[PDB]
RNA sequence: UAUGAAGAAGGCCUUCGGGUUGUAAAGUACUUUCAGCGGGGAGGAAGGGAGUAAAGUUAAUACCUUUGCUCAUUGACGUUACCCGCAGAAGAAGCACCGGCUAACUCCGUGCCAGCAGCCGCGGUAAUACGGAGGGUGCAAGCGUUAAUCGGAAUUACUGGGC
C-alpha cells in the first residue's frame with residue numbers, strides 16, 4: 328500500500344501458467360499412441376468416452392481424447408494432437424486431430440467437416 | 451411496352467363544373483386520368499359528387515401497369531367532389547397516406563371576373 | 569469477394585428495402601416484404617442489443633457490397649480522418665467508383681454499374697480504371713469509354729436514372745455520357761434512416 | 774446484369790388448407806473484367822565507346838582534358854506497365870455457426886446410449902445442444918480449430934485495490 332513499502336518491494340508480474348504444458352507453447356505435436364482404452368466421464372454425465380494414451384516426441388506422456396465417432400486406432404499409431412481440455416475427463420487436456428497422419432477422418436461427417444479432417448462429399 | 455412504379459400521388463381538380471382525377475408519380479409524370487365528363491355524365495350530372503366517385507372507378511386502371519398501392523392525395527378547387535372521390539380511392543384498394551389541400555389562394559393577386567348579375 | 573446468391577432474400581432480410589434490384593418492377597410483387605426468409609420467418613423475432621447493431625452494419629455493407637475486411641479498413645481510415653467518423657465512413661463508401669457510376673446513371677443496379685466498371689467500360693480523367701473501390705476525388709470528370717457507349721444496357725440505365733432524384737454533388741450528363749464528382753456528399757443527402765453513431769460504437773467495442 | 778410468379782417442379786414442413794425453398798431456377802434480353810487467344814507497346818537507360826570541332830592545357834596549344842556536338846549504342850526481368858482486337862456466361866464459392874452468453878430452427882433419427890462441450894451444460898423415448906434433413910446467420914478465396922501476446926482483468930491497483 329505505502330509507496331515507501333512498494334519502493335522497497337516492487338510489484339511482481341505474475342506469470343500465467345498454460346493449460347497445455349506438454350505442448351510447450353506449440354499449436355500441435357506429433358506422438359505415438361502408447362495405449363488405446365476407454366474411460367468414464369465425470370459426475371453429472373454417464374457414457375463410455377474414448378481416450379488414448381500417447382507418447383509425444385519431446386518425451387511427455389499424456390492422454391488425449393478422440394472427438395470423432397469410430398476410430399481405426401491401435402498400438403504404435405502416429406497421430407497429431409492439439410490443445411483443448413475435456414470438461415468431464417480430469418487429466419485430459421488434448422484432442423486428437425481427426426483426418427491427419429494415421430488418424431482417418433470421421434465417417435459420414437456433413438457439418439463441421441473441417442473440424443474432423445473429412446474431404447468434401449462429391450455432389 | 452411501358453414501365454411500372456409505386457408511391458404515387460393523386461391530384462384532384464374539384465371545379466364547380468367538373469372533377470379531374472389524375473394519378474401521377476412523385477415527379478409529376480402522369481400515369482392515368484379519368485373525368486366525370488368522360489364517364490358518361492354531361493350537364494348537371496358532370497358535377498354531382500356521385501359522378502366524381504364514378505370517375506375514380508375508371509382511374510382504378512393502371513393497376514398492372516403501375517402497382518401504386520400507397521399514394522398521396524392533392525386536392526385543389528372548391529367545387530363539389532372534395533369528399534366523394536376520396537372514398538372511391540379507399541374502396542378501390544389504395545393506401546391513402548396524406549391528404550392536403552393545394553387550392554390556389556392568391557394573396558390579392560389578379561383581378562377576378564365581374565359578378566354574374568344573372 | 570462478391571455475393572452471388574439470391575438478392576430478394578437479403579432485401580426482405582434486414583427489412584427496409586435499400587437500393588437493390590433494377591428498381592422498375594415493384595419490389596413487393598417480386599417477393600413478400602415484411603417477412604424474413606426461412607420456414608420460421610413468419611413470426612416476430614424479439615431482437616436483442618447485439619442484434620440491432622449487427623443488422624445496421626450488415627444493412628450498410630450490402631447497400632454498397634462491402635465485405636467485412638474491406639469495411640473495417642474504411643472504419644480505420646474514417647477514425648483516422650478528422651471530423652465525425654460515421655459521416656466520413658459514409659462519404660468514403662459513397663466515393664467508391666462503382667457506387668458513383670450507379671448514382672451517375674450508367675448502371676441499372678449497383679452490381680451492374682460495378683460490373684460496368686469491372687468490364688473496362690469507364691474512363692476517369694483519360695485513364696482506364698476497372699477497380700470498383702477506386703476513390704473518386706472532387707472536381708474529377710468521369711466519362712464512359714467510347715467503345716462502352718455502344719452497350720444498350722448503359723443507355724437504358726440512363727433513362728431510369730431520372731426517377732432517382734439526381735444527387736446534387738454529381739453533375740450527370742445525358743448525351744455527353746459523362747459526370748463530374750463536384751464534391752464530397754453530405755449526411756443530409758444520404759438516407760436519413762442510417763444511424764452512423766451506432767456503427768461507430770459497434771466497431772469501437 | 775436485367776427481365777423473369779400457376780410463387781414452375783423438386784426439397785422440407787404442414788392447421789393438409791397451406792407455407793417454405795424463391796425470381797432462386799428455367800426462360801428471355803444484356804455484358805465480356807480477369808482468366809482463353811491474337812496483335813501492338815511505354816518505362817526502367819544513366820552510361821561509356823567511336824568520332825568530331827573549339828576551349829583550358831604547350832617548346833610544339835602536339836600530349837591530354839573540358840566543353841559542345843556526330844554515328845552507332847546496351848534491359849536480367851520480358852511473350853514486360855499498358856493499349857487494341859477476338860469469342861462466349863461462357864472457365865472461377867466455399868467455410869463456420871443457428872441452447873444461453875451470441876446473430877441465426879424446425880423435422881427425423883437416437884434414448885445418460887452414441888455423442889457435443891470456450892463457459893453455462895446437453896442426452897434417461899415429443900433433444901431449438903448429439904446424429905441427419907430442410908431452412909437460416911456470420912465470414913469469404915478463404916472459413917474454422919489449435920498455439921501465442923495484450924485487452925477486457927481496478928484480477929499486483931503509480932495512475933488504479935484492500936486487511
Ligand SMILES: [Mg+2]
Pocket residue numbers: 637
Ligand atoms: Mg481478400
Ligand SMILES: [Mg+2]
Pocket residue numbers: 807808
Ligand atoms: Mg485477360
Ligand SMILES: [Mg+2]
Pocket residue numbers: 876
Ligand atoms: Mg440468438
Ligand SMILES: [Mg+2]
Pocket residue numbers: none
Ligand atoms: Mg487464446
Ligand SMILES: [Mg+2]
Pocket residue numbers: none
Ligand atoms: Mg491491471
Ligand SMILES: [Mg+2]
Pocket residue numbers: 934935
Ligand atoms: Mg478487493
